[PDB]
Amino acid sequence: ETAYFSDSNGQQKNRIQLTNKHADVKKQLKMVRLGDAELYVLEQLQPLIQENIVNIVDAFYKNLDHESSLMDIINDHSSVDRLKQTLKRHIQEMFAGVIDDEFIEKRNRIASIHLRIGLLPKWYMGAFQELLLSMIDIYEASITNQQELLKAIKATTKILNLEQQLVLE
């Protein structure tokens, strides 16, 4: 049969570039078992994710109007239409297959931003779940090997958990 993933170990090295500024982050990646192999997997999903980001962002803002105050927050500072563009690029930065200082530093920046505008952490956390769900949905439609499917899901739960760790608290 055909496979979705390449297993090219030549291809999956050096995907963690962290200095001592980010000395805890290397521990954190080790605990969620985020490594070269998982990052290479992330990198190969990026096309799927890219091809589907518009559905992923639409679904995300749609979910948020379950809580009117989250929408007030958005409309006080911006608009959905304009947050989508930046969410597209953030989501896609998750599937780049490299964790480095800049990656971290950008995550700390968006954290501070949500802190400022008053997002409460439980809505922040809840919001990552529509992402997960839309991704799983994209995987299933496109990855019909059951074993490769699980592999895409596990990698994804890993990168999302690191995302949540970065923004908290």
Please report, as ranges, the residues that interact with ligand HEM according to CB under 6 A: 64, 70, 73-74, 77-78, 83, 86-87, 90, 110, 113-114, 117, 119, 123-124, 127-128, 131
Closer to ligand HEM by Cβ: residue 13 or 89? 89
Residue 128 phi/psi, 5-degree rounding, is: -65, -15
Cα-atom radius of gyration of the chain, to the nearest Å? 16
Task: Give me the amino acid identity at 39.
Answer: L
The distance of closest approach from Cβ of residue 106 to ligand HEM in the complex, given in angstroms and rounded to an integer, is 7
Residue 118 phi/psi, 5-degree rounding, is: 85, 30
98 CB-contact burial (10 Å; exposed 0-12 / middle 13-18 / buried 19+):
middle
Written as six digits, the tokens of 127 are 């919001």
- Nearest-10 Cα torsion for 15, 20, 22, 25: 70
User: Does 166 participate in binding ligand [C-]#N (rule CB under 6 A)?
Assistant: no
The distance of closest approach from Cβ of residue 65 to ligand HEM in the complex, given in angstroms and rounded to an integer, is 9
Q: Note the residues at the interface with its own copies (CB under 8 A).
A: 24, 27-28, 30-33, 63-64, 66-67, 121-130, 132-133, 136, 140, 146, 149-150, 153-154, 157-158, 161, 164-166, 168-169
Residues near ligand [C-]#N, by CB under 6 A: 83, 87
